[model samples]
Target: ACQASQLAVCASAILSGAKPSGECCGNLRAQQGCFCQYAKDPTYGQYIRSPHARDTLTSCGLAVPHC
Candidate 1:
């Protein structure tokens, strides 16, 4: 299970198109299994569905969640 607190560093990048910092990418990779959960979250679902989030994952060498 991923802790939202661990991924907090990703908010600006995921929400506002800010460049994902190394720590953000690290957190992202650490929480790769974390996507589907948030994808279903109405509050956060939008962010995960955005182009910026996809690009951020790609930039970090991760895949978009199927969920």
Candidate 2:
């Protein structure tokens, strides 16, 4: 499971249009491979399930994998 702090960092980065901080990008890069898997989990699924989340990730230049 990802740390709450890290998740918050990633979420905030996505929500805002500003470039992700090094720590935020580091956390995301560390979890890159696990993103899809985490997305499938029911708890996180809802949070990242929204179209807005998809758009946010896309806008942030994060390539979203097909779920």
Candidate 3:
């Protein structure tokens, strides 16, 4: 299996309510262990706070700590 870093998806895309594509989900899954790291960064924090992002994660069956 291969993987991509969490930083590949930009905050704008996450905030735009666009559904995660296969590539995005792949990156998300591979980097699932580091969501906290992504969420804590100021540049990407807003995306983590976005309702759309929360919905996306939830829909993926991933329980987010907070959003």
Candidate 4:
């Protein structure tokens, strides 16, 4: 299940453009389908909606879902 909070592994990389780790990428991919909804969340929105998000996803080889 894609609990938004469970994807915390992605915060640093998504928000700060740090290198995405295996844990981060795994959680991120698990939540891939839930990204748009997470983007609407005030807490997660900034992180998931950050410009670095796309870059991080790209680096992780994940598709940035159109929100």
- Tens digits of per-residue lDDT, candidate 2, 1-67, equal 6433346776754554455566766666677677776567666666665665566566556788886
The best candidate in terms of TM-score:
4
Off by over 4 Å in 1: 2-6
How far does residue 3 in candidate 3 sit from its true spot (Å)? 14
TM-score, each model? Answer: 0.82, 0.58, 0.67, 0.83
Pairs that clash in candidate 3: none
Return the clash pairs for model 1, or none.
Answer: none
RMSD for each model, in Å, please?
Answer: 1.7, 3.3, 4.3, 1.6
lDDT of each: 0.79, 0.63, 0.62, 0.80
Best by lDDT: 4
Order of all candidates by lDDT, from best down to worst? 4, 1, 2, 3
Of the candidates numbered 1 and 3, which has the greater TM-score value?
1
